[PDB]
Amino acid sequence: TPAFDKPKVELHVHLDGAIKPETILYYGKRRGIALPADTPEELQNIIGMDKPLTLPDFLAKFDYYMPAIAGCRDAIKRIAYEFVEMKAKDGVVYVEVRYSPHLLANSKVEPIPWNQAEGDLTPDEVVSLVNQGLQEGERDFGVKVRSILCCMRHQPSWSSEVVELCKKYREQTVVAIDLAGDETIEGSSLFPGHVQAYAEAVKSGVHRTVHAGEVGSANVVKEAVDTLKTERLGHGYHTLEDTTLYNRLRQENMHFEICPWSSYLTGAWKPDTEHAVIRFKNDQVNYSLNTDDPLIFKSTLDTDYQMTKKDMGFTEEEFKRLNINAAKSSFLPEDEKKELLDLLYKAYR
Ligand SMILES: NC(=O)c1cn([C@@H](CO)CCc2cccc3ccccc23)cn1
Ligand SMILES: [Zn+2]
Fold it and tell me: Pick the catalytic residue: 10, 161, 214, 257?
């Protein structure tokens, strides 16, 4: 069974797509919000996907469930805690977990998310709670954990507060900024609010990844690298449709954060074609394997490794390879990075 039963590193998994069904149901029931079902298994079966969906039908799923967690202090911290726990069961020794703090708040945020009424959990406060839970789960479960705060493509007005938050909470546990949501929104890599937040991220030494090339063209990747200056790419698949861009990103050792099982379910990769990650293997690309959203995809990190093992021929040596590349591409301090790698190279012999 477990396709690679060695320690792992994971760089691309959203907190808000990594919540236990039973906990959604717990706070639902407690706060009165109500959800398409009431068992874990039935709710799991509704939230989860086995087929690609339109964008509204994907985001709808966040409309059911998020109101159970958003705006409640204790829920925010618990989700962060229990995430750490899950990763511990996948055999991860280092993970960077991301989310938008505005999406879990119910005050000082406009528009207020998910139909929520106004309350008094701010977005700053959300980062603080998340930090707590993640630093407790690290202490308890033995996985080292950092986080990344996501700007939202359709809301550049939030972005300078993201980067200010990454600066306030830096190392502690936040190490980087991301740009998530709908990458197909015309012009959205270039909205001034996002460009100025990632230029402030450069100025203040906050690391940067951006989702690009998932469903968006190669030009969206090119904007992420050349104008937002990103250091890593979320998926990056469609880079392959620009050959000189592909070649240059290999020459600069850019890291590609691949989510093979997510890409099948979303329809990002059409199942009747060469998956991009096999090209990346054949090419010796610097890339990682990741879950993206285990809740929505009905997955664990072994799902993705079984997919690449069983469907695409991937070997132990390649699994060891890309984990090491993930550690090398982490946003940890230099010292902590060398320490991670020392750990891994040791487990791997
Ligand atoms: N797989 C993903 O794209 C994704 C994004 N998120 C959260 C933040 O961690 C944002 C969810 C969301 C909110 C509003 C608009 C969206 C548009 C597209 C995708 C996600 C959106 C979780 N999973
Ligand atoms: Zn993602």
Answer: 214
Q: Given in angstroms, what resolution was this structure solved at?
A: 2.0
Annotated catalytic residue 214: yes
C-alpha to C-alpha distance for 133 and 16, rounded to whole angstroms: 14
CA dist., res. 297 & res. 261, Å (int): 8
Is 292 annotated as a binding-site member?
yes
Q: Is 149 in the pocket of ligand 1 (CB under 6 A)?
A: no
Best CA proximity match to 19, nearest among 73, 60, 76, 63: 76
Domains of the chain: 1-349 (3.20.20.140)
Element (H, E) at 262: helix 260-265
Q: Is the CB of 180 under 6 A from ligand 1?
A: yes
| Residue of 18, 37, 20 whose CA lies nearest to 29 | 37
CB atoms inside a 10 Å sphere around CB 270: 11
Choose the residue to mutate in 13, 19, 58, 220 for probing ligand 1, maximizing ligand atoms within 8 Å of C-beta: 58
Ligand found nearest the CA of 293: 1
Q: How was this structure determined?
A: X-ray
Which of 49, 18, 24, 50 is closest to 37 using CA atoms?
A: 24
